[PDB]
Design a protein around this nucleic acid. Structure first.
Length: 95
DNA sequence: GAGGAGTTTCCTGTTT
DNA sequence: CAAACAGGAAACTCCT
């Protein structure tokens, strides 16, 4: 999973390797939240070998996922996103 | 090389 | 006030 969204999912489905980076707000609906935004952006930059990655830019790539329905926009909830019908491998019976 | 997907950068404005 | 959220645009990195 070299794509941003897969990277996010991978962290969320591996809590035993999660430095309190993120957590499910509702695992059944695929609603999640960033607990350490810059820290996650850092790891993501790291993965692509880019020490200048920030949450700001990571979020821009996240917003591009709405049109593609890889993510469903969640309003009124800072740092809270939600997996869309086009994403996969995150359900309690899909992993 | 050409052209597209998926970001990465930048920026300006709005909202929380 | 300090972060997030919003998108349009343009530049980049792979892939076929």
């Amino acid at each position: 999973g070299t794509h941003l969204w897969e990277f996010i999912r991978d962290i969320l489905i591996h809590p035993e390797l999660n430095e309190g980076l993120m957590k499910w707000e509702n695992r059944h609906e695929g609603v999640f939240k960033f607990l350490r935004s810059e820290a996650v952006a850092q790891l993501w930059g790291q993965k692509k070998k880019n020490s200048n990655m920030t949450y700001e830019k990571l979020s821009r790539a996240m917003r591009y996922y709405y049109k593609r329905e890889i993510l469903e926009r969640v309003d009124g909830r800072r740092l809270v996103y939600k997996f869309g019908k086009n994403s996969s491998g995150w359900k309690e019976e899909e992993v």
